[model samples]
Target: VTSYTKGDLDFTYVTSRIIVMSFVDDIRSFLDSRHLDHYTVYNLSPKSYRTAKFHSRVSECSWPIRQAPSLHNLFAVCRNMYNWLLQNPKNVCVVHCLDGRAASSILVGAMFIFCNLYSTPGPAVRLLYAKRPGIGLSPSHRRYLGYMCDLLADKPYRPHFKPLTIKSITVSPVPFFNKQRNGCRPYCDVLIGETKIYTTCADFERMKEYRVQDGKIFIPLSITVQGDVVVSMYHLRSTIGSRLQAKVTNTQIFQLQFHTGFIPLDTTVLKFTKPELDACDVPEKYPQLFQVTLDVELQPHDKVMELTPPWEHYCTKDVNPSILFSSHQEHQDTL
Candidate 1:
C-alpha cells in the first residue's frame, strides 16, 4: 500500500509526524481524494470545516487575536502532540490557521522549544522559516516563543521591561550625501551606551532627530543577562514615509563566553548593511531613517552587568503591525 507520508511540500515529512496548518479549502479535498488515514490534525479558530469528511480526524483549538494564547495552552498542545507521536510513531499530525504564516509557525515553533528540539525560540522559528520559506513570526510571537524558551530553561518569562536609555549614540561618519553614485545611502556604525550596535543610514539620521526631540533617544529594548545567557530586543526607529524596509542586524548566533571576568559576556559587532540597496533605486524611497528592530541572545554564561526589562510594546496584545511577524533579515534592513 502506498502511504501518504509526506506533506504537499515533501520536505515537511521529516522527523515530526505532527503537522500544524491554517484553514484552507484545498486541504480537505487533498486528504479525501487520497483517502488519507492514521494522521491527527489540529484546527485553530474553528467554527466548522470546509468538508465534514475530515471531522473524524480533526480537533479544535481556539484563541482570539487579543490575549491569543497562554503558556499553559502552548505547553498543553506540545505535551499532547508529543504523547501522540510516542504512541504512533508512523502517524502524522496537521495544524493550520488562516494563511499558514504567523499562527502556524508560532504554534509549531513552540513545539520545537518545549520538546528541547531547539535551543531557543529565535532559533526554533529560524528553523521553521528555513523549512518553509517566507514563513514569518511577529514580535509578539517572538515574545511568546522567548517565554516558552525561558520556561523550558526554568527561567522566569515575565514580559516586562524598563525604558531603553542610551548615554550617547555614536554613528560612523557617512556623508548625508556621498560622492559615490547613490551618495546618500543608509549605513552607520552606532554605539548604544558602551555596547556596539549598527544601524541603517535612515536610522542614523533619525537618531539625530530623536536626540533633538526629547534630548534623549528611546526605543523599547529588552536586555536580560542571566548567569550565562544574554537576551536583547535591540530596537531603533527612523522617520516613517514612502518606503518600507526591514532586516536582521546580527545573523550570527552568539554564545555568552567569558572573554574576561570583568566583561561578563562579549557581544559580536551587531551590524546591518545590504549590497542590494547600493544597486537599487533607493534614493527617493529610502525613508529618511529606518525603524530598526533586532533580536539577540548570548548563551554561554557570560552576562552583562546591567540589563533592561522586556519591551513594554511586547507586553501588549496590539503590536505595531510592521514589526509583527517580521523576519530577522527584514528586521535588520528595516530602520
Candidate 2:
C-alpha cells in the first residue's frame, strides 16, 4: 500500500497553513523513500514512528484507542503544533489518522480555536465542513473543541448547564438477559469535563446493575458534571474466570454521548442497551451473537437545570449520530 488518500483533503480547518488527510502504513514508506521534504507530520495512529531518519520529524501523538484522544494530549499536541507552526514559517503541517477525518478533524478544530481563528468550535466545524465536506466529528470532540479556549486560558471550565449535577449513571442489562445470569466482570468508562474516572471491575451478572457515580459501591471516578459527559461500559481480556471471572474478549460493549439540557431531570429511562467488551455487541455481530440499557441520570442541585432549555441543535439528545465519537485516554486528564 503506497500512500492512499480520499483526495478530499482540507486546506487546514481554517484555510490556513495546515492540512488534514487520512493515510496509513504506506505513509511510513511514503515519507521514508519519497523525496518529500519541508513538512511536519502529526501521526495520530500507531506503528508510524519507528523510522527515525526522516528529515523534519513525525510527531507520535497517537491515540491507539481510535475514537478520541485524551484532552491532555489534545491540548499538548495543539500547543506543540501551534508553536511549531509559528517557528517553521515555511513547512506545512500534515495531520493524518487511520481514516483522516475523526481524529484529524478534532485536532484541527481545537487548533483553530487556539489560534483565535474562530471564536468557537461550531464555526470552525462549519468551515471544515464546507472545505472537506465529509468531516464528521464526535460529540466528545465537539465538546472538547468547545473547551479548547477555556483550557488554554487556564480558566474554570464552564459547562453548558448551569446546575445539573450528573448524579450517577446506571448500566442495567436489558430485560432479555434476566435468565441464565450469564456472568460478567466489567467496569465503567467515564469522561466529564477534563478528567476520566474509570471504575474497577465488578462481578457482572446478566441482570445486575452498575452505577457510574464517584465510588458507587465500587468507586468509579465521579464528577458532578454540568455539561459534557461520555460513559461506556467495558470489559477486559485479562480479568474474569478463574472462579475469578468470565471468558469474555475485551471491547467497549456499550457507549453513549450526553450533554447539556438533553439529560432528563427525572424520569425518562434513556436506554441504549449492551456493554463494551467484544462480548457485548460483538457476540451479536461477529463472535456469534447481543441488549443492555444505559441510563444517564442528571440531578440538578435545581432551578438552574430548568433555566437553560432552549438548545437549538440539542446535541446528544439522541446519539446525534453526526457529532459523537470521542472518549478521552484513560491516563492523565485536567478537569
Candidate 3:
C-alpha cells in the first residue's frame, strides 16, 4: 500500500507493514506466520476455516453481505484501513485471488475506488483491464462497482427500500440431468432481505415446459419484502412434498442473486446477478456451475434504485469492445 503512489524502484513501501488481501481460506494456504494483517472477501465453499489463526483479523467480507454487514460498512472499513495505511506510511498491501485474475482485481481496484483514488468506477475498472487483460469484469461486478461509485460520490442510493411485489419471474432453460424416478420436483426460493419464501406450482404439467435442450420454471410471486430481491431455484429428485428438493442425480441447485434495479420498467430480461462466487467456484463441474437466465417482467414498483449520473453514464450507452462497457478505451487520457 504505497498509499496510491506512482513511483519506481526507489519505492519506500518495501519496508511497510504488510497487509495481505485474498480469499478467506486462500490466505492460510500461502503464508502462515499468523502475523501479517490479512483481509478476505469470501470463501464460496464450506471447509475448515483454518485461517490466519488469530494473529490478525481475517474478516469475511460478504459477497451478498451474508450477515454482520450492510455494504456501507465495507466502504467505511476500507477507507479507515486505507487511511491507516497512509498514516502508517510504512505499510504495504499485497493482494491476490485464486489466480491473480478477476476477483483479486476487483478487491484491489475496489479498495482503490472506495478510497476515492478515481471518481469514476467504469473507467477505473476498464483501466485495470488495460493494465492486465484477464480482469474478466462481469455485469453484476460492474453493478457493484457502480453502486460503490454512487456511495463514494454522495449520489442517491436505492430510492426504494420499501416492500415491493415480484409480479412474474420467467426463469428459462433450467437443466435437469438423467435419472429421477418420478420426474423432477422443482421449486424456488425467493429471498428479499432476511425474509425467504419457498414456492412451487400446483399443476405439474403446466409448470414443466420440457423442450429439446432443457426446461423452465415460471413462478407467479404475490410476494413482497423490504430489501434487495433475489431467487433460488432447486432442481429436485421428484419427491414433490416440501418442494425445497434438489434434482438428486446431477445435483446442482442454481439460484443467482437478482437485483430489482435492473428489472426494467416495461418488459425486459435479466441474467441473474450471481455475485457468482458459488457458481464460479467451478466453471463446469464440482459445485453448481450454471447461470439462470430469465425474463423479469414486472409492473412498475413505486420506487427503485436508479443509476446516478456518473453510474448511469457508466451503465447506459456506448459499448467497450475490450471488456464490453459503454466507456473509453484504455489508450486515451483515462489513465
Top-lDDT structure, candidate number = 2
lDDT value, candidate 2, whole model: 0.50
Off by over 4 Å in 3: 1-54, 60-70, 73-77, 94-105, 130-137, 154-158, 173-185, 192-209, 212-216, 237-254, 258-334
lDDT of each structure?
A: 0.42, 0.50, 0.43
lDDT of 3 by residue, 53-157 (tens): 632433333233331122333344455445445543333344333342444455545554654546578777865666445447554455556666654564535
TM-score against native, each model: 0.43, 0.53, 0.53
The better-scoring model by TM-score among 1 and 3 is 3
* Ranking 1 against 2 by lDDT, winner: 2
**Greater-lDDT candidate between 1 and 3:** 3
RMSD per prediction, one decimal? 14.7, 12.2, 10.3
Residue-level lDDT for 103 in candidate 3: 46
Residue 260 lDDT, candidate 2, scale 0-100: 43
